[PDB]
Amino acid sequence: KLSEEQQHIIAILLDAHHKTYDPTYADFRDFRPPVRMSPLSMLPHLADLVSYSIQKVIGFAKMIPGFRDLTSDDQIVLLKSSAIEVIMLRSNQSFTMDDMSWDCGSQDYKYDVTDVSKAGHTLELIEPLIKFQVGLKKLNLHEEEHVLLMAICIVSPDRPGVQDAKLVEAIQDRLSNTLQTYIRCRHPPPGSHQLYAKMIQKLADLRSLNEEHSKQYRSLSFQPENSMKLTPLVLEVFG
């Protein structure tokens, strides 16, 4: 049932993810240091973390089968709109339900509600984000499923500004069908029960998170002294 084209897709995506996701988190040392101790104390560190994570999401995206047949303008629009969402999705790998934190290997790099709050965010974003993390983590995805969902998130044809939507859809459709078929052949029940649908629902939850994030961004953004603490990439991508 899983064709050779579909096995190839999955193998490309697993490797691309491995090339762009370091589970030792060694590069975190290059970020401006976190400060816990002060309302925006964590902002430099998390801005840096986000900025790096944008870079890695781009590196992953470039490797998506089909992505390179898209025009530059379309590449750009897909990345601008999906970046935060893929960062949210990829963060699930460090997210632990033990204490509802993202644990990047050491206490310095273990982030919780109060760390995020000290980056200029409120429960308007954080509560539904931790709920996302929890509900995503409970799906217990195979890594194969994880990378397919991130790819499907990026190659989304309804993002506004998209020119060649039909091309975006054919690409996305190839990855949806690979994901559908993978779950059927490799995901045993009961974990497979309604699993595609539950994954598609998470992409819907990410639309709402993206919305709220863009709103908090605009607010922070309006204060030139905080906007100063960001990075040039983050300013370019998040506007």
């Binding site: 781009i58 590196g59 995206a61 470039k62 530059s72 750009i76 990345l79 601008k80 370019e236 991508v237």
Partner: peptide
């Protein structure tokens, strides 16, 4: 477009 860094990282 005015997205030079993102253009550059995509090429």
């Amino acid at each position: 477009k005015n997205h030079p860094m993102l253009m550059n990282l995509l090429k």
